[PDB]
Each structure stands twice: as C-alpha cells, then as structure tokens.
Amino acid sequence: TSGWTFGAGAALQIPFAMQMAYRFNGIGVTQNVLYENQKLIANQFNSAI
Amino acid sequence: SECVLGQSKRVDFCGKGYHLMSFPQSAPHGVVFLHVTYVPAQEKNFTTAPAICHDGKAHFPREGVFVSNGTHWFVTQRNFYEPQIITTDNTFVSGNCDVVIGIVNNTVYDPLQPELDS
Amino acid sequence: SECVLGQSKRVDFCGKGYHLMSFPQSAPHGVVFLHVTYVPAQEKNFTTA
C-alpha cells in the first residue's frame, strides 16, 4: 500500500501500478512500458507466485 | 566508509529514513555515528492518474507524479509537494492513450506558444 | 531493511536480476524472501554508434 515510504518514515498511499512504475524507473526502465503492458506484467507476477 | 565518506542509498543502514550524511564520534573501545536523515513530515491526499490525454497521446511525468487538487492537475516531486503546470517539458509522450488504464483527459501546456505569439 | 523496505541496487543481493520488490514470509526459526526481479527476455542484434 505504501511502497518504500513506510520504511523511511510515515506511510504514504499510492496505487500499486504506480509503485511498480516507480520500481521500473528505479531499474532504469521507462515507466510507460509498465502501463502499456500492465495486464501481462500482473499475469507474469501471479504465475511466478 | 558508506555513511561518513558518502551518502548511502541502502535502507536503514545509515539510520532510519532517507540518509543525508553521518558524523563519527569516538567512544571508549567503540564508535558512535550520528546519522542525519530526511524524513517526510506532513501528508496530504491527492487524486493521481498514471498519465494524461491531450491530443490522443499519453503523457507521463519525466520525473515526479501527476496530482490533482479538488479541481486542477499538476506534476510534483515524488518526495515533496511542489505542484507545477503540466507542460511539454515536464512530461514525455508515448503512443496513444487508449492503452493505459486510468488515464485522465487534460490539457498539456506548450511553453513555445506564448513566445511564438510575440 | 533493503530488499523489503526499499529497492536495492546491489547485484544478486535481493535475488538475481534487477530487483523490484521482495515479500517476507515467516518460517520456523527462519525467514523466507520472495525476491521479484525484472529479467530481460528476448534479445535482438542492432548496429550502434
């Protein structure tokens, strides 16, 4: 619900899709690809779990 | 090495919060570190969208996030509320916006227009 | 602290690949981490300058 914010201070809500976009930007990948392939990415994550 | 001689990106290594710097302090048979960290203080709920439609094209913030007060939309920093007008400099375009989920229609301001008039 | 409460740039620390997020899981006298990592999949040759 709060990404990494709750680990560095007060927890701040954020949509999980936008949190994954934050991660994608962190790994050096443009966030737009996440929104363009969100369904596929979520499917892959569920399959991996 | 990582807290005093530099700014560590590791979480909770050089203190709790966003690390800024540290100051060593000698102790008998030990050492004391004074980790200075940046901590967000006061929150505010905002309505946010992953992108924006201007002319059938999806717009995303180059760095920051789209937020919306009661009426208007702005692009602000990820760790501090500094709203700004949605401009072509603040955002980058990518394809059309019939693919993104949750996109919201809005105008994207063009800095070139006012100067082109003169 | 690093893998769960944040995104780590350390290679092969929070699993192998480009770390995105991790999920802790309690175990008897131990802990289990589910490291989610972005992994390039399909390569393609290009000429670069």
PDB file of C-alpha atoms in Angstrom:
ATOM      1  CA  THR A   1       0.000   0.000   0.000  1.00  0.00           C
ATOM      2  CA  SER A   2       2.847   2.454   0.707  1.00  0.00           C
ATOM      3  CA  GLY A   3       5.801   1.222  -1.353  1.00  0.00           C
ATOM      4  CA  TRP A   4       9.063   2.021   0.410  1.00  0.00           C
ATOM      5  CA  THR A   5       7.685   5.150   2.098  1.00  0.00           C
ATOM      6  CA  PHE A   6       6.675   3.379   5.315  1.00  0.00           C
ATOM      7  CA  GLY A   7      10.258   2.159   5.775  1.00  0.00           C
ATOM      8  CA  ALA A   8      11.727   5.669   5.659  1.00  0.00           C
ATOM      9  CA  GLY A   9       9.001   7.437   7.652  1.00  0.00           C
ATOM     10  CA  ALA A  10       5.242   7.912   7.546  1.00  0.00           C
ATOM     11  CA  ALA A  11       3.450   5.542   5.187  1.00  0.00           C
ATOM     12  CA  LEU A  12       2.120   7.258   2.053  1.00  0.00           C
ATOM     13  CA  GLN A  13      -0.570   5.552  -0.010  1.00  0.00           C
ATOM     14  CA  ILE A  14      -0.014   5.031  -3.735  1.00  0.00           C
ATOM     15  CA  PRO A  15      -1.656   2.801  -6.381  1.00  0.00           C
ATOM     16  CA  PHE A  16       0.257  -0.443  -6.784  1.00  0.00           C
ATOM     17  CA  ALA A  17       0.547   0.104 -10.537  1.00  0.00           C
ATOM     18  CA  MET A  18       2.275   3.426  -9.876  1.00  0.00           C
ATOM     19  CA  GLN A  19       4.502   1.745  -7.278  1.00  0.00           C
ATOM     20  CA  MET A  20       5.568  -0.800  -9.894  1.00  0.00           C
ATOM     21  CA  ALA A  21       6.184   2.121 -12.255  1.00  0.00           C
ATOM     22  CA  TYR A  22       8.432   3.602  -9.569  1.00  0.00           C
ATOM     23  CA  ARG A  23      10.315   0.296  -9.442  1.00  0.00           C
ATOM     24  CA  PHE A  24      10.613   0.216 -13.239  1.00  0.00           C
ATOM     25  CA  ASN A  25      12.079   3.722 -13.244  1.00  0.00           C
ATOM     26  CA  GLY A  26      14.423   2.594 -10.477  1.00  0.00           C
ATOM     27  CA  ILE A  27      15.797  -0.283 -12.555  1.00  0.00           C
ATOM     28  CA  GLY A  28      16.320   2.175 -15.406  1.00  0.00           C
ATOM     29  CA  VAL A  29      13.249   1.220 -17.470  1.00  0.00           C
ATOM     30  CA  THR A  30      10.813   3.925 -18.546  1.00  0.00           C
ATOM     31  CA  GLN A  31       7.577   3.767 -16.568  1.00  0.00           C
ATOM     32  CA  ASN A  32       5.364   3.953 -19.668  1.00  0.00           C
ATOM     33  CA  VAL A  33       6.119   0.333 -20.599  1.00  0.00           C
ATOM     34  CA  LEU A  34       4.543  -0.780 -17.326  1.00  0.00           C
ATOM     35  CA  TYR A  35       1.263   0.951 -18.145  1.00  0.00           C
ATOM     36  CA  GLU A  36       1.436  -0.373 -21.706  1.00  0.00           C
ATOM     37  CA  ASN A  37       1.884  -3.999 -20.544  1.00  0.00           C
ATOM     38  CA  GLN A  38       0.256  -3.948 -17.076  1.00  0.00           C
ATOM     39  CA  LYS A  39      -2.068  -6.890 -17.751  1.00  0.00           C
ATOM     40  CA  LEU A  40       0.798  -9.077 -18.964  1.00  0.00           C
ATOM     41  CA  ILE A  41       3.072  -7.998 -16.103  1.00  0.00           C
ATOM     42  CA  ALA A  42       0.429  -8.779 -13.478  1.00  0.00           C
ATOM     43  CA  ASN A  43      -0.212 -12.149 -15.119  1.00  0.00           C
ATOM     44  CA  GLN A  44       3.509 -12.945 -15.004  1.00  0.00           C
ATOM     45  CA  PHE A  45       3.726 -11.916 -11.345  1.00  0.00           C
ATOM     46  CA  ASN A  46       0.758 -14.102 -10.390  1.00  0.00           C
ATOM     47  CA  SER A  47       2.176 -17.033 -12.359  1.00  0.00           C
ATOM     48  CA  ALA A  48       5.547 -16.602 -10.641  1.00  0.00           C
ATOM     49  CA  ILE A  49       3.885 -16.640  -7.220  1.00  0.00           C
TER      50      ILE A  49
ATOM     51  CA  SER B   1      33.055   4.147   4.531  1.00  0.00           C
ATOM     52  CA  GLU B   2      29.438   4.270   3.336  1.00  0.00           C
ATOM     53  CA  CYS B   3      27.805   6.623   5.877  1.00  0.00           C
ATOM     54  CA  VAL B   4      30.524   9.198   6.628  1.00  0.00           C
ATOM     55  CA  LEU B   5      32.574   9.200   3.411  1.00  0.00           C
ATOM     56  CA  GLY B   6      29.448   9.134   1.238  1.00  0.00           C
ATOM     57  CA  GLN B   7      25.666   9.150   1.023  1.00  0.00           C
ATOM     58  CA  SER B   8      24.425   5.571   1.346  1.00  0.00           C
ATOM     59  CA  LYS B   9      21.388   4.525  -0.688  1.00  0.00           C
ATOM     60  CA  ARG B  10      20.856   1.436   1.483  1.00  0.00           C
ATOM     61  CA  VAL B  11      17.684   1.474   3.573  1.00  0.00           C
ATOM     62  CA  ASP B  12      18.085   1.698   7.366  1.00  0.00           C
ATOM     63  CA  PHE B  13      21.861   1.244   7.051  1.00  0.00           C
ATOM     64  CA  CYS B  14      22.951   4.798   7.920  1.00  0.00           C
ATOM     65  CA  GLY B  15      19.972   5.406  10.181  1.00  0.00           C
ATOM     66  CA  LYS B  16      16.230   5.243   9.626  1.00  0.00           C
ATOM     67  CA  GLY B  17      14.893   7.458   6.845  1.00  0.00           C
ATOM     68  CA  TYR B  18      16.395   8.989   3.736  1.00  0.00           C
ATOM     69  CA  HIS B  19      20.099   9.255   4.524  1.00  0.00           C
ATOM     70  CA  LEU B  20      21.755  12.669   4.182  1.00  0.00           C
ATOM     71  CA  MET B  21      25.094  12.277   6.000  1.00  0.00           C
ATOM     72  CA  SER B  22      26.678  10.927   9.177  1.00  0.00           C
ATOM     73  CA  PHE B  23      29.178  12.209  11.736  1.00  0.00           C
ATOM     74  CA  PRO B  24      31.564   9.830  13.547  1.00  0.00           C
ATOM     75  CA  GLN B  25      32.204  10.229  17.265  1.00  0.00           C
ATOM     76  CA  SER B  26      34.967   8.499  19.204  1.00  0.00           C
ATOM     77  CA  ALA B  27      33.927   6.292  22.123  1.00  0.00           C
ATOM     78  CA  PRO B  28      35.961   4.139  24.533  1.00  0.00           C
ATOM     79  CA  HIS B  29      36.508   0.814  22.758  1.00  0.00           C
ATOM     80  CA  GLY B  30      33.842   1.768  20.246  1.00  0.00           C
ATOM     81  CA  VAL B  31      32.464   4.302  17.794  1.00  0.00           C
ATOM     82  CA  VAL B  32      29.297   6.408  17.676  1.00  0.00           C
ATOM     83  CA  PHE B  33      27.605   7.546  14.458  1.00  0.00           C
ATOM     84  CA  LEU B  34      25.167  10.472  14.266  1.00  0.00           C
ATOM     85  CA  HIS B  35      23.141   9.657  11.153  1.00  0.00           C
ATOM     86  CA  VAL B  36      21.375  12.711   9.709  1.00  0.00           C
ATOM     87  CA  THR B  37      18.349  11.656   7.660  1.00  0.00           C
ATOM     88  CA  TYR B  38      15.486  13.290   5.772  1.00  0.00           C
ATOM     89  CA  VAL B  39      12.009  12.292   6.969  1.00  0.00           C
ATOM     90  CA  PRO B  40       8.707  13.314   5.322  1.00  0.00           C
ATOM     91  CA  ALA B  41       6.589  15.173   7.865  1.00  0.00           C
ATOM     92  CA  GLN B  42       3.118  16.330   6.746  1.00  0.00           C
ATOM     93  CA  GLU B  43       0.932  14.442   4.275  1.00  0.00           C
ATOM     94  CA  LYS B  44      -1.966  15.434   2.029  1.00  0.00           C
ATOM     95  CA  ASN B  45      -4.276  13.245  -0.039  1.00  0.00           C
ATOM     96  CA  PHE B  46      -4.298  13.954  -3.776  1.00  0.00           C
ATOM     97  CA  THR B  47      -6.025  12.384  -6.755  1.00  0.00           C
ATOM     98  CA  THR B  48      -3.476  10.933  -9.170  1.00  0.00           C
ATOM     99  CA  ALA B  49      -3.513   9.415 -12.647  1.00  0.00           C
ATOM    100  CA  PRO B  50      -0.858   7.308 -14.399  1.00  0.00           C
ATOM    101  CA  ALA B  51      -0.850   9.599 -17.454  1.00  0.00           C
ATOM    102  CA  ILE B  52      -2.878  12.267 -19.280  1.00  0.00           C
ATOM    103  CA  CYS B  53      -4.584  12.579 -22.668  1.00  0.00           C
ATOM    104  CA  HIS B  54      -4.003  15.782 -24.647  1.00  0.00           C
ATOM    105  CA  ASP B  55      -4.395  15.032 -28.378  1.00  0.00           C
ATOM    106  CA  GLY B  56      -4.869  11.278 -28.343  1.00  0.00           C
ATOM    107  CA  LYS B  57      -1.370  10.785 -26.910  1.00  0.00           C
ATOM    108  CA  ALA B  58      -0.418   9.511 -23.465  1.00  0.00           C
ATOM    109  CA  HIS B  59       1.675  11.856 -21.317  1.00  0.00           C
ATOM    110  CA  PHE B  60       3.857  10.708 -18.421  1.00  0.00           C
ATOM    111  CA  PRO B  61       5.926  12.781 -15.975  1.00  0.00           C
ATOM    112  CA  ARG B  62       9.636  12.881 -16.759  1.00  0.00           C
ATOM    113  CA  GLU B  63      10.331  12.951 -13.013  1.00  0.00           C
ATOM    114  CA  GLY B  64       7.619  13.311 -10.385  1.00  0.00           C
ATOM    115  CA  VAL B  65       3.968  12.306 -10.309  1.00  0.00           C
ATOM    116  CA  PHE B  66       0.645  13.687 -11.503  1.00  0.00           C
ATOM    117  CA  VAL B  67      -1.520  15.001  -8.659  1.00  0.00           C
ATOM    118  CA  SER B  68      -4.878  16.765  -8.594  1.00  0.00           C
ATOM    119  CA  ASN B  69      -6.310  19.160  -6.067  1.00  0.00           C
ATOM    120  CA  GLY B  70     -10.090  19.418  -5.956  1.00  0.00           C
ATOM    121  CA  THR B  71     -10.203  20.897  -9.469  1.00  0.00           C
ATOM    122  CA  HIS B  72      -6.851  21.188 -11.264  1.00  0.00           C
ATOM    123  CA  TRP B  73      -3.991  18.849 -12.177  1.00  0.00           C
ATOM    124  CA  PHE B  74      -0.285  19.373 -11.501  1.00  0.00           C
ATOM    125  CA  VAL B  75       3.007  17.479 -11.682  1.00  0.00           C
ATOM    126  CA  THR B  76       5.004  17.454  -8.446  1.00  0.00           C
ATOM    127  CA  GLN B  77       8.070  15.833  -6.938  1.00  0.00           C
ATOM    128  CA  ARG B  78       7.883  12.319  -5.526  1.00  0.00           C
ATOM    129  CA  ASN B  79       9.021  13.362  -2.023  1.00  0.00           C
ATOM    130  CA  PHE B  80       7.785  16.963  -1.677  1.00  0.00           C
ATOM    131  CA  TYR B  81       4.611  18.775  -2.763  1.00  0.00           C
ATOM    132  CA  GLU B  82       5.746  21.342  -5.351  1.00  0.00           C
ATOM    133  CA  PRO B  83       2.901  21.415  -7.889  1.00  0.00           C
ATOM    134  CA  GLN B  84       3.607  22.768 -11.361  1.00  0.00           C
ATOM    135  CA  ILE B  85       1.653  23.259 -14.571  1.00  0.00           C
ATOM    136  CA  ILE B  86       1.614  20.244 -16.886  1.00  0.00           C
ATOM    137  CA  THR B  87       3.919  21.296 -19.736  1.00  0.00           C
ATOM    138  CA  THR B  88       5.735  19.527 -22.553  1.00  0.00           C
ATOM    139  CA  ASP B  89       8.981  19.943 -20.594  1.00  0.00           C
ATOM    140  CA  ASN B  90       7.550  18.231 -17.504  1.00  0.00           C
ATOM    141  CA  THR B  91       6.127  15.234 -19.399  1.00  0.00           C
ATOM    142  CA  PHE B  92       7.113  12.910 -22.236  1.00  0.00           C
ATOM    143  CA  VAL B  93       4.747  11.426 -24.814  1.00  0.00           C
ATOM    144  CA  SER B  94       4.275   7.758 -25.680  1.00  0.00           C
ATOM    145  CA  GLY B  95       1.830   6.284 -28.187  1.00  0.00           C
ATOM    146  CA  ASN B  96      -1.912   6.870 -27.853  1.00  0.00           C
ATOM    147  CA  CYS B  97      -3.886   6.833 -24.607  1.00  0.00           C
ATOM    148  CA  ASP B  98      -6.396   4.086 -25.413  1.00  0.00           C
ATOM    149  CA  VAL B  99      -3.929   1.576 -23.922  1.00  0.00           C
ATOM    150  CA  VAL B 100      -3.120   2.996 -20.477  1.00  0.00           C
ATOM    151  CA  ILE B 101      -5.542   2.123 -17.672  1.00  0.00           C
ATOM    152  CA  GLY B 102      -6.904   5.005 -15.614  1.00  0.00           C
ATOM    153  CA  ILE B 103      -5.698   7.848 -17.840  1.00  0.00           C
ATOM    154  CA  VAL B 104      -7.494  11.185 -17.476  1.00  0.00           C
ATOM    155  CA  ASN B 105      -8.182  13.852 -20.090  1.00  0.00           C
ATOM    156  CA  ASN B 106      -6.480  17.218 -19.614  1.00  0.00           C
ATOM    157  CA  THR B 107      -4.626  19.970 -21.446  1.00  0.00           C
ATOM    158  CA  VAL B 108      -0.829  19.898 -21.731  1.00  0.00           C
ATOM    159  CA  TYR B 109       0.530  23.440 -21.824  1.00  0.00           C
ATOM    160  CA  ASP B 110       3.059  24.389 -24.507  1.00  0.00           C
ATOM    161  CA  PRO B 111       5.833  26.797 -23.398  1.00  0.00           C
ATOM    162  CA  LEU B 112       6.526  27.730 -27.032  1.00  0.00           C
ATOM    163  CA  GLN B 113       3.060  29.160 -27.714  1.00  0.00           C
ATOM    164  CA  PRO B 114       3.294  32.415 -25.683  1.00  0.00           C
ATOM    165  CA  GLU B 115       6.722  33.281 -27.101  1.00  0.00           C
ATOM    166  CA  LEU B 116       5.679  32.399 -30.659  1.00  0.00           C
ATOM    167  CA  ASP B 117       2.894  34.987 -30.399  1.00  0.00           C
ATOM    168  CA  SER B 118       5.417  37.800 -29.890  1.00  0.00           C
TER     169      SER B 118
ATOM    170  CA  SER C   1      15.734  -3.479   5.599  1.00  0.00           C
ATOM    171  CA  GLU C   2      16.945  -3.196   1.997  1.00  0.00           C
ATOM    172  CA  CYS C   3      15.073  -5.801  -0.062  1.00  0.00           C
ATOM    173  CA  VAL C   4      11.639  -5.376   1.551  1.00  0.00           C
ATOM    174  CA  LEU C   5      11.536  -1.780   2.824  1.00  0.00           C
ATOM    175  CA  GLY C   6      13.111  -0.474  -0.387  1.00  0.00           C
ATOM    176  CA  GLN C   7      14.573  -1.205  -3.797  1.00  0.00           C
ATOM    177  CA  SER C   8      18.192  -2.376  -3.764  1.00  0.00           C
ATOM    178  CA  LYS C   9      20.753  -1.664  -6.483  1.00  0.00           C
ATOM    179  CA  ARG C  10      23.092  -4.331  -5.082  1.00  0.00           C
ATOM    180  CA  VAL C  11      23.568  -7.114  -7.622  1.00  0.00           C
ATOM    181  CA  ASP C  12      22.403 -10.607  -6.620  1.00  0.00           C
ATOM    182  CA  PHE C  13      21.557  -9.353  -3.121  1.00  0.00           C
ATOM    183  CA  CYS C  14      17.752  -9.449  -3.391  1.00  0.00           C
ATOM    184  CA  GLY C  15      17.732 -12.360  -5.806  1.00  0.00           C
ATOM    185  CA  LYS C  16      19.340 -12.497  -9.252  1.00  0.00           C
ATOM    186  CA  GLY C  17      18.236  -9.876 -11.763  1.00  0.00           C
ATOM    187  CA  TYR C  18      17.045  -6.291 -11.490  1.00  0.00           C
ATOM    188  CA  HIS C  19      15.358  -6.185  -8.090  1.00  0.00           C
ATOM    189  CA  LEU C  20      11.840  -4.735  -7.983  1.00  0.00           C
ATOM    190  CA  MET C  21      10.302  -5.800  -4.661  1.00  0.00           C
ATOM    191  CA  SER C  22      10.520  -8.508  -2.013  1.00  0.00           C
ATOM    192  CA  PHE C  23       7.968 -10.097   0.314  1.00  0.00           C
ATOM    193  CA  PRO C  24       8.945 -11.625   3.683  1.00  0.00           C
ATOM    194  CA  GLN C  25       7.466 -14.883   4.928  1.00  0.00           C
ATOM    195  CA  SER C  26       7.817 -16.248   8.446  1.00  0.00           C
ATOM    196  CA  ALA C  27       9.199 -19.759   8.856  1.00  0.00           C
ATOM    197  CA  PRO C  28      10.037 -21.829  11.952  1.00  0.00           C
ATOM    198  CA  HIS C  29      13.345 -20.431  13.238  1.00  0.00           C
ATOM    199  CA  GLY C  30      13.903 -18.631   9.948  1.00  0.00           C
ATOM    200  CA  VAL C  31      12.625 -16.217   7.327  1.00  0.00           C
ATOM    201  CA  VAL C  32      11.833 -16.562   3.625  1.00  0.00           C
ATOM    202  CA  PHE C  33      12.086 -13.821   0.990  1.00  0.00           C
ATOM    203  CA  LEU C  34      10.265 -13.759  -2.362  1.00  0.00           C
ATOM    204  CA  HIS C  35      12.513 -11.523  -4.461  1.00  0.00           C
ATOM    205  CA  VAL C  36      10.726 -10.099  -7.510  1.00  0.00           C
ATOM    206  CA  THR C  37      13.242  -9.256 -10.233  1.00  0.00           C
ATOM    207  CA  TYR C  38      12.997  -7.764 -13.710  1.00  0.00           C
ATOM    208  CA  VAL C  39      14.810 -10.001 -16.206  1.00  0.00           C
ATOM    209  CA  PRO C  40      15.463  -9.201 -19.891  1.00  0.00           C
ATOM    210  CA  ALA C  41      13.886 -11.932 -22.004  1.00  0.00           C
ATOM    211  CA  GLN C  42      14.229 -11.551 -25.799  1.00  0.00           C
ATOM    212  CA  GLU C  43      17.423 -10.104 -27.256  1.00  0.00           C
ATOM    213  CA  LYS C  44      17.912  -8.652 -30.731  1.00  0.00           C
ATOM    214  CA  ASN C  45      21.043  -7.519 -32.561  1.00  0.00           C
ATOM    215  CA  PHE C  46      21.365  -3.869 -33.569  1.00  0.00           C
ATOM    216  CA  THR C  47      24.104  -1.712 -35.042  1.00  0.00           C
ATOM    217  CA  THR C  48      25.158   1.019 -32.621  1.00  0.00           C
ATOM    218  CA  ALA C  49      27.366   4.102 -32.730  1.00  0.00           C
TER     219      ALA C  49
END
